[PDB]
Enzyme design. Structure first.
Site, PDB file in Angstrom:
ATOM      1  N   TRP A 183      -1.731  10.299  10.307  1.00  0.00           N
ATOM      2  CA  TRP A 183      -1.652   9.490  11.511  1.00  0.00           C
ATOM      3  C   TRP A 183      -0.740  10.147  12.534  1.00  0.00           C
ATOM      4  O   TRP A 183      -1.114  10.341  13.682  1.00  0.00           O
ATOM      5  CB  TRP A 183      -1.138   8.085  11.178  1.00  0.00           C
ATOM      6  N   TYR A 187      -7.830   3.371   5.942  1.00  0.00           N
ATOM      7  CA  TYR A 187      -6.418   3.418   5.570  1.00  0.00           C
ATOM      8  C   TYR A 187      -6.179   2.765   4.222  1.00  0.00           C
ATOM      9  O   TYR A 187      -5.383   3.242   3.416  1.00  0.00           O
ATOM     10  CB  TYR A 187      -5.565   2.734   6.624  1.00  0.00           C
ATOM     11  N   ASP A 245     -10.061  -2.663  14.125  1.00  0.00           N
ATOM     12  CA  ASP A 245      -9.460  -3.158  12.895  1.00  0.00           C
ATOM     13  C   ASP A 245     -10.134  -4.451  12.433  1.00  0.00           C
ATOM     14  O   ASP A 245     -10.525  -4.565  11.276  1.00  0.00           O
ATOM     15  CB  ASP A 245      -7.964  -3.397  13.078  1.00  0.00           C
ATOM     16  N   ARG A 258      -6.948  -3.134  17.795  1.00  0.00           N
ATOM     17  CA  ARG A 258      -7.162  -4.521  17.363  1.00  0.00           C
ATOM     18  C   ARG A 258      -8.621  -4.834  17.063  1.00  0.00           C
ATOM     19  O   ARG A 258      -8.961  -5.243  15.951  1.00  0.00           O
ATOM     20  CB  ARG A 258      -6.663  -5.508  18.416  1.00  0.00           C
ATOM     21  N   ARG A 293       0.830  -1.198   0.000  1.00  0.00           N
ATOM     22  CA  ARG A 293       0.000   0.000   0.000  1.00  0.00           C
ATOM     23  C   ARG A 293       0.868   1.252   0.000  1.00  0.00           C
ATOM     24  O   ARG A 293       1.764   1.394   0.828  1.00  0.00           O
ATOM     25  CB  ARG A 293      -0.928   0.003   1.217  1.00  0.00           C
ATOM     26  N   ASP A 325     -12.445   0.479   6.249  1.00  0.00           N
ATOM     27  CA  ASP A 325     -10.990   0.557   6.341  1.00  0.00           C
ATOM     28  C   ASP A 325     -10.528   1.867   5.694  1.00  0.00           C
ATOM     29  O   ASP A 325     -10.236   1.927   4.501  1.00  0.00           O
ATOM     30  CB  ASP A 325     -10.332  -0.665   5.679  1.00  0.00           C
ATOM     31  N   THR A 347       0.649  -7.053  16.878  1.00  0.00           N
ATOM     32  CA  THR A 347       0.558  -6.856  15.416  1.00  0.00           C
ATOM     33  C   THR A 347      -0.212  -5.592  14.985  1.00  0.00           C
ATOM     34  O   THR A 347      -0.221  -5.232  13.802  1.00  0.00           O
ATOM     35  CB  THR A 347      -0.083  -8.069  14.725  1.00  0.00           C
ATOM     36  N   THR A 348      -0.858  -4.925  15.939  1.00  0.00           N
ATOM     37  CA  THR A 348      -1.502  -3.636  15.676  1.00  0.00           C
ATOM     38  C   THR A 348      -0.454  -2.564  15.433  1.00  0.00           C
ATOM     39  O   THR A 348      -0.769  -1.494  14.937  1.00  0.00           O
ATOM     40  CB  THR A 348      -2.390  -3.181  16.848  1.00  0.00           C
ATOM     41  N   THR A 349       0.784  -2.884  15.806  1.00  0.00           N
ATOM     42  CA  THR A 349       1.947  -1.996  15.777  1.00  0.00           C
ATOM     43  C   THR A 349       1.891  -0.942  16.876  1.00  0.00           C
ATOM     44  O   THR A 349       2.800  -0.112  16.994  1.00  0.00           O
ATOM     45  CB  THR A 349       2.130  -1.268  14.402  1.00  0.00           C
ATOM     46  N   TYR A 354     -11.644   4.366  11.138  1.00  0.00           N
ATOM     47  CA  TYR A 354     -12.545   3.250  10.866  1.00  0.00           C
ATOM     48  C   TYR A 354     -13.994   3.587  11.174  1.00  0.00           C
ATOM     49  O   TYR A 354     -14.816   2.686  11.395  1.00  0.00           O
ATOM     50  CB  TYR A 354     -12.105   2.004  11.652  1.00  0.00           C
TER      51      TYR A 354
HETATM   52 MG   LIG Z   1      -7.007  -5.892   9.483  1.00  0.00          MG
HETATM   53 MG   LIG Z   2      -2.387  -6.254   7.215  1.00  0.00          MG
END
Ligand SMILES: [Mg+2]
Ligand SMILES: [Mg+2]
Ligand SMILES: [Mg+2]
EC number: 4.2.3.61
Length: 536
Positions: A261, A515, A432, A429, A252, A513, A389-391, A508
């Site tokens: 952001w 993003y 998302d 999380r 992306r 989504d 994993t959400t960072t 969101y």
């Molecule tokens: Mg996702």
């Molecule tokens: Mg992804």
């Protein structure tokens, strides 16, 4: 050899941010005037013999105008005086505003203030259903509840339903302000977004605006926006010279959205270095999420994960060619960070961000493995991986890199996963997974956390999504409780975590989504904050 193709829409901005020449003559003119209006406003605040309600309206207006960061001291001193006085002989309007402002600033005012507006069942008196300003302020206040505020349980539902009923017949701009609040409440909004709306759509059209404050806010906004535009140009150039647009086509292309952001985390001038460091990190880790999801064979992702842990250019030869590209970029980035902080001796603190990134990358590889194997874990196991994993642990830590007041004690606190940070991570999380499903699953996914929650609790997709949205609501209570004094660290280091949560709700909104599909949601935000000035 596989290979997915998510058919991602490409950047909609092209060149237009790449070059920004600041009009230094104009900038000096604005700064000149602003200094005068700043003192005019400081004296408005330091006025004496003001009514409680007049005082709260003043502060609220200043905050919403986006110029309150000029008056942290003044506003603090006033709210502290109010918190300690126990005045409560007021109406719904003033009581709810008093509640919200003190709570937003960490003052643990009791929610008993609302008892006079309820019956013996703790339900709000429906006789209040025709106090639209009171309803409006209660609505706002209802979003800063903590777990200890169950007395406010009815507030959102009650205020909402009567605001909706009233709105069509209200005068402008009040109508527009009600309608807007119903869609986006103040507390959970991104500050610059809410400020642009307020200044331009509401305050500018009030019959009774204070002209000094209006002029102050327009000039300050347009002036900060010049700095933002400079940062985005500098960042657009950094991004363009990386040419991931062609050398990494699978990912992306969203560096502007990344800047938005970072701007959400902080907009103030003194955080310029921080913003620029942050956004570089956001866009870079975004490349990695795009390699572990689509284009990522389990074979290939393994070597990458091992390379990140070992963290050494010597390991590039072990990697596929396109992965080499990403990986030297990352390592280079952190040496930039090191030299950029080299001057302030704050160089050492970079390794806090690095260890968090290693953590993210590790958990990306788990998530990958789960899809390829088709493993649908228990929702508990799923979260123990999916949170990182959400960072967001990583972005939170990164956001401190640029803040000059950040001490090692701040990082040590952040590193122990404090409750406010985990709540923010949780909101990201669960929202998302609700919004980016199905996007995902439209890459034929099956590793999705929603599908876990369904299989685990034996519940439908709609049902699961609710229970997730509910986890978000619980986590907001923990964020609000995280801000209350005494705070474990300075408020300065709490606000970025709060703002991280806000960005989730905003990006969101309506369960889309924003993003991956910036079109509907983010594009307007970006235009108003970074393209169009406020017409003066
Ligand atoms: Mg996702
Ligand atoms: Mg992804
Ligand atoms: Mg992912």
């Amino acid at each position: 050899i596989v290979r997915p193709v998510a058919d991602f829409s490409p950047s909609l901005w092209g060149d237009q941010f790449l070059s920004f020449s600041i009009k230094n003559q104009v900038a000096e003119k604005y700064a000149k005037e602003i200094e005068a209006l700043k003192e005019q406003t400081r004296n408005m605040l330091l006025a004496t013999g003001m009514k409680l309600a007049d005082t709260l309206n003043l502060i609220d207006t200043i905050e919403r105008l986006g110029i309150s960061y000029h008056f942290e001291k003044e506003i603090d001193d006033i709210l502290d005086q109010i918190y300690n006085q126990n005045s409560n002989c007021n109406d719904l309007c003033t009581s709810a505003l008093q509640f919200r402002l003190l709570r937003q600033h960490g003052f643990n005012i009791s929610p008993e203030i609302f008892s006079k507006f309820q019956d013996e069942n703790g339900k709000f008196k429906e006789s209040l259903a025709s106090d639209v300003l009171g309803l409006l302020n209660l609505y706002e206040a209802s979003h800063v509840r903590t777990h200890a505020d169950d007395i406010l349980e009815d507030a959102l539902a009650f205020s909402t339903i009567h605001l909706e009923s009233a709105a069509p017949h209200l005068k402008s701009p009040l109508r527009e302000q009600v309608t807007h609040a119903l869609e986006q409440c103040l507390h959970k909004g991104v500050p610059r977004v809410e400020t642009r709306f307020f200044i331009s759509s509401i305050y500018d059209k009030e019959q009774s605006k204070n002209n000094v404050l209006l002029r102050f806010a327009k000039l300050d906004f347009n002036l900060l926006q010049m700095l933002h535009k400079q940062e985005l140009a500098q960042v657009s150039r950094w991004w363009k010279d990386l040419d991931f647009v062609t050398t990494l086509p699978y990912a992306r292309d969203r560096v502007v959205e990344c800047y938005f952001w970072a701007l959400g985390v902080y907009f103030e001038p003194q955080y310029s270095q921080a913003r620029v460091m942050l956004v570089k990190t956001i866009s870079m880790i975004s490349i990695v999420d795009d390699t572990f999801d689509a284009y990522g064979t389990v074979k290939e992702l393994e070597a990458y994960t091992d390379a990140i842990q070992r963290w050494d250019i010597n390991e590039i030869d072990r990697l596929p060619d396109y992965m080499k590209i990403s990986y030297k970029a990352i390592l280079d980035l952190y040496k930039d960070y090191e030299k950029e902080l080299s001057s302030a001796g704050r160089s050492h603190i970079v390794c806090h961000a690095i260890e968090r990134m290693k953590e993210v990358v590790r958990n990306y590889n788990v998530e990958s493995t789960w899809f390829i194997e088709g493993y649908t874990p228990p929702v508990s196991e799923y979260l123990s991986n999916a949170l990182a994993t959400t960072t967001y642990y990583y972005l939170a830590t990164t956001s401190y890199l640029g803040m000059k007041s950040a001490t090692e004690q701040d990082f040590e606190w952040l590193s122990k996963n404090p409750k406010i940070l985990e709540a923010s991570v949780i909101i990201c999380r669960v929202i998302d997974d609700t919004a980016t499903y199905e996007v995902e699953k439209s890459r034929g996914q099956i590793a999705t956390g929603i599908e876990c929650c369904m299989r685990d609790y034996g519940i439908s997709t709609k049902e699961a999504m609710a229970k997730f949205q509910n986890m978000a609501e619980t986590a907001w209570k923990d964020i609000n409780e995280g801000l209350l004094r005494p705070t474990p660290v300075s408020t300065e280091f709490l606000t970025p975590i709060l703002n991280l949560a806000r960005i989730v709700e905003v990006t969101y909104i309506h369960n889309l989504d924003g993003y991956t599909h910036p079109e509907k949601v983010l594009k307007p935000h970006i235009i108003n904050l970074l393209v169009d000035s406020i017409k003066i």
